[PDB]
Amino acid sequence: ADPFESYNPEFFLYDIFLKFCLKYIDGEICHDLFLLLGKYNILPYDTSNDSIYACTNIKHLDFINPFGVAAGFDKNGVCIDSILKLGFSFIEIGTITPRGQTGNAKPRIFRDVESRSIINSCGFNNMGCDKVTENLILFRKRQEEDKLLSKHIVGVSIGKNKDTVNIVDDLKYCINKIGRYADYIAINVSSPNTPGLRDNQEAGKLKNIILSVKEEIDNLEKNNFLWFNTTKKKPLVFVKLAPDLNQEQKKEIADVLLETNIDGMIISNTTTQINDIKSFENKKGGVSGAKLKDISTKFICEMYNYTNKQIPIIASGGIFSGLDALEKIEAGASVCQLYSCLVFNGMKSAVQIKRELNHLLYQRGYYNLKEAIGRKH
Ligand SMILES: Cc1cc2nc3c(=O)[nH]c(=O)nc-3n(C[C@H](O)[C@H](O)[C@H](O)COP(=O)(O)O)c2cc1C
Ligand SMILES: CCOC(=O)c1[nH]c(C)c(Cc2ccc(C(F)(F)F)cc2)c1C
Ligand SMILES: O=C(O)c1cc(=O)[nH]c(=O)[nH]1
C-alpha cells in the first residue's frame, strides 16, 4: 500500500515514530507504547486475503499464513486482537506463571540497531495466570463475533514462578486455568533469565515434564463448550528449546520428543553465546535478532534430522525478510514467529514479510509453501 494515501499497516507516520523510538527512547518504554496503542485499537489493520499458496498447518492447526508473533511480545494477552490484525496468523502469549511477578529490575531490554540485535533479562514479568486467563477469555468472546479474527490461532507459553522448586507444579496450575482457551501450549524450558530453567531440557527431566503436561491437558475433559478456542479441540503441546546445547544434548532431546509424541518444537529461544556486540558487553541476558539467525537455522536443520522429520518445527530467531523465512522453511520449519522484526521494522512487518515470501515462492518455482518445507535436505 501507499504509505501516504491511507491508514494501513504501512502508514508512513508509524515509520517516523519508529525511527524516533529507535534513536531516543528506552526499549521497554517503546514496547509499552506499542502495546498501549494496540490495547485501544488505534493500530491499522491488514484486511487482505492472505495467499492460499502460503498457508501451513501443524496437524489440525491451520495457519492462514506462515507468520506469528513469538512469546514475550504480549506477555499478558492485553492486545491480542490488534497484534493479529497487523497481518499475523497467530500469537504466542506469555510466558505466564501461576502468580503475578515483577521480573528483574529495569533497564532490562537493550537494542543494538547496527546489528539488529536485542538483549533482555526480563525474568518472566507477567500479571499471572488468573489475570491473563481473563484477558484471553475476553479475546475469545470478541473472536466469536469478528470476521477478521475467526481463524486466528492463540497459543499460551507457560513457565514457573521465580521461587518454584518443581516446575511441573506450576505448569499444571496454568494448564488447569487457561488450557481450555488455548490452541496450543508451549512449554518454556529455555529462558536464560530464570536460573536453572534450562536444566529441565535434560532428557529425563524433559520427558517427565512433557508427559505431565499432556496428562494434565488430557484430564481437562475428564474433570469438565469445553474447548473455547479456535480449533475446538484440546491444545497441542509444543516445547521451546534453547540454542545453547551440544550435539549430545540435542540428540537426547530429539529422542525424548519422539518418545513422548510431542506435537511440535519451537526452535529457538535466545542465546547467551553472542559476545561480539560491543554495546552489550556489560549486559546480562539472552540475545535475539539478526545475530541469532544462523545459530537457530542450523539448530532447525539438526533437530529436523535428529527427529527424522517427524516433529513439526516453529521457527524463531533472526527472521526479518522473506528470504530469512524461506531459509527457515527450507531448513525444516512449518511456520515462523517474529519478534525482533517488529522492533526494527515496526507496524508494517507482517504485510511486508508476507509479500516478500510470496514473491520468493514464485521466483523459486514452488507451487506452495508446504512443498518448500524441509527442501534443503
Ligand atoms: C524482550 C523479550 C522477551 C522475551 N520473552 C520471552 C518469553 O516470555 N517466552 C519465550 O518463550 N520467549 C521470550 N522471548 C524470546 C522470543 O520469543 C524469541 O524466541 C527470540 O526473541 C528470537 O526471535 P527474534 O530473533 O525474531 O527476536 C523474548 C524475547 C525478547 C526480546
Ligand atoms: C525490544 C524492546 O521493544 C522495542 O524497542 C520496540 N518494541 C516494538 C513493538 C517496537 C516498534 C514500535 C513501533 C512504533 C511505535 C509507536 F508507538 F511509536 F508508533 C512503538 C514501537 C520497538 C521499537
Ligand atoms: O522473561 C524473559 O526474561 C525471557 C523469557 C524467555 O523465554 N526468553 C527470553 O529471552 N527472555
Q: Whose CA is nearest to atom 21 of ligand 1?
A: 288
Residue type, 370: K
Alpha-carbon distance of 29 to 56, in angstroms, equals 34
Cα 74 vs. chain centroid, distance in angstroms?
Answer: 10
Written as nine digits, the cell of 269 is 529461544
CA of 365 to the centre of ligand 1 (A): 33
Please report the resolution in angstroms. Answer: 1.8
Distance CA 369, CA 357 (A): 9
Strands 153-158 and 90-96: parallel
Q: Is the peptide bond before 164 cis (omega within 30 degrees of 0)?
A: no
Q: Point out the ligand 1 atom lying closest to the alpha carbon of residue 28.
A: 1
Ligand nearest to the CA of 194: 3
Place of cell 560491543: 278
Q: How far is the CA of 361 from the centre of ligand 3 (A)?
A: 32
**Which ligand is nearest the CA of 31, by number?**
2
Q: Which residues pair with 110 in a beta bridge?
A: 119
Distance CA 188, CA 338 (A): 17
Please give the full DSSP string across 26-61, using - where no structure is assigned.
Answer: -HHHHHHHHHHHHHTT-S----PPPPGGG-EEETTE
CATH of residue 159's domain is 3.20.20.70
Question: What is the number of structural domains in the chain?
Answer: 1
CA separation for the pair 231, 90 (Å, rounded): 12
Would you say 211 and 166 are in contact if contact means Cβ atoms under 8 Å apart?
no
Measured CA angle at 332 (ends 197, 297), to 5 deg? 60
For residue 22, what is the DSSP state? Answer: H
Ligand 2 centre distance from Cα of residue 199 (Å): 32
Range of the domain at 345: 1-377
Nearest ligand, CA of residue 292?
A: 1
Pairing assessment for the beta strands 264-267 and 153-158 based on DSSP bridges = unpaired
Rounded to whole angstroms, the Cα distance separating 10 from 290 reads 22
Question: What method was applied to determine this entry?
Answer: X-ray
**Residue carrying C-alpha cell 489493520:** 45
Side-chain-side CA neighbours of residue 269 (13 Å): 26
Strands (E), 97-241: 109-112, 117-120, 153-158, 184-188, 236-241
Q: Which entry of 190, 191, 268, 334 is annotated as an active-site residue?
A: 191
Q: What is the dihedral of CA 178, 93, 233, 63, to 10 degrees?
A: 170
Taking a C-beta distance cutoff of 8 angstroms, is the pair 281, 319 a contact?
A: no
Report the SS3 class of residue 7: coil
Q: What secondary structure letter does DSSP report for 194?
A: S
The helix (run of H) or strand (run of E) holding residue 67 is strand 67-69
Helix (H) or strand (E) holding 91: strand 90-96
3-class secondary structure per residue, 245-314: CCHHHHHHHHHHHHHHCCCEEEECCCECCCCCCHHHCCCCCEEEEHHHHHHHHHHHHHHHHHCCCCCCEE
Closest atom of ligand 1 to 186 CA is: 11
Pocket test for ligand 2, best of 16, 34, 35 (most atoms within 8 A of CB): 34
What does the buried/exposed string (b/e) look like for 31-69 if buried means 16 or more CB atoms within 10 Å of the residue's CB? beebbebbeeeebbbbeeebbeebbbebeebebbbbbbb
Confirm or reject: Cβ of 269 under 6 Å from ligand 3. Answer: yes
- Per the annotation, does 124 bind a ligand? yes
Q: Which of 314, 324, 316 is nearest to 356 (CA)?
A: 324
- Would you say 268 is a known binding-site residue? no
Contact 157, 186 (CB under 8 A): yes
In which element (H, E) is residue 143 found? helix 129-144
Q: Retrieve residue 206's grid coordinates.
A: 524433559
Helix (H) or strand (E) holding 175: helix 167-178
Largest CA distance in the chain: 58
**Which amino acid is present at 296?**
S
Which residues, listed in sequence order, are joined to residue 120 by a DSSP beta bridge? 109, 286
How many angstroms separate the CA atoms of 112 and 119, rounded? 8
Residue 136 burial (C-beta neighbours within 10 Å; 0-12, 13-18, 19+): buried
48 annotated as ligand-binding: no
Closest-lying ligand 1 atom to the alpha carbon of residue 109: 1
Name the residue of 104, 339, 341, 345 to mutate for ligand 1: max ligand atoms within 8 A of Cβ. 339
Cβ of 212 less than 6 Å from ligand 3: no
Please check if 193 is assigned to a binding site. yes
What is the residue type of 76? N
Dist. CA 265–CA 206, nearest whole Å = 13
Task: Extract the C-alpha cell encoding 266.
Answer: 519451537
Is 81 within 8 Å of 140 (Cβ atoms)?
no
Q: What is the DSSP letter of 107?
A: P
- Using only the alpha carbons of the chain, give its radius of gyration: 19
191 catalytically annotated: yes
Measuring CA to CA, which residue among 247, 192, 187 is closest to residue 217? 187
CA distance 226 to 90: 21
Distance 260 CA to ligand 1 centre (A): 25
What is the 8-class DSSP label of residue 9?
T
Please, what is the Cα angle at 326 between 38 and 45, to 5 degrees? 20
Closest CA to 97 of 136, 131, 128: 128
Conformational region of residue 89, where left means phi above 0, alpha means psi within -120 to 50, and beta covers everything else: alpha
Rounded-to-integer distance, Cα 197 and Cα 36, Å: 31
> Do the annotations mark residue 74 as ligand-binding?
yes
List the one residue out of 236, 344, 334, 361 whose CA is nearest residue 291.
344
